[PDB]
Amino acid sequence: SGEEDEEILFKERAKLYRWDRDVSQWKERGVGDIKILWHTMKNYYRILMRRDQVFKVCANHVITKTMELKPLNVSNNALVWTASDYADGEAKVEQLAVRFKTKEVADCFKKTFEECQQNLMKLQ
């Protein structure tokens, strides 16, 4: 509902993890559709993801030109990046990992994500 002014560039099922910098492991953060959104008039891009049943936000942040989306080492399903994220009600720098059903979807997510970033530079 709070996405009225944004076109959906990507929307697929995913599992999202956050790096716990103590127990040194990935802790599950949510399961549901993850989106890449584009605010038409204000010209910015955003990641947004709500959990399946409860509909709590598990990721929400603007895409920046310095973010680096790489694979989780040799994986074909999982991608990894650092974002200053708002899910907990304030901006916190988190290390995120998102894993898709197929290799194909993951590739598409990467490609779209990178497309958005390029547009960021085309206007700088």
Whole-number Å distance between alpha carbons of 40 and 95 = 28
Task: Write down all domains in the chain, each with its CATH number in brackets.
Answer: 1-124 (2.30.29.30)
Nearest residue to 98 (alpha-carbon basis) of 22, 28, 43: 28
Count of H helices and E strands in the chain? 1, 7
Q: What token pair was written down for 33?
A: 């559709």
Q: How was this structure determined?
A: X-ray
Nearest residue to 46 (alpha-carbon basis) of 68, 69, 23, 64: 64
Q: What token pair was written down for 49?
A: 């993801």
Q: What token pair was written down for 117?
A: 């970033």
Cα 122 versus chain centre, distance? 21
Resolution in A: 2.5
The rounded radius of gyration (Å) of the Cα atoms in the chain is 14
**Which residues have C-beta within 8 Å of that of residue 108, sequence separation ≥ 6?**
10, 12
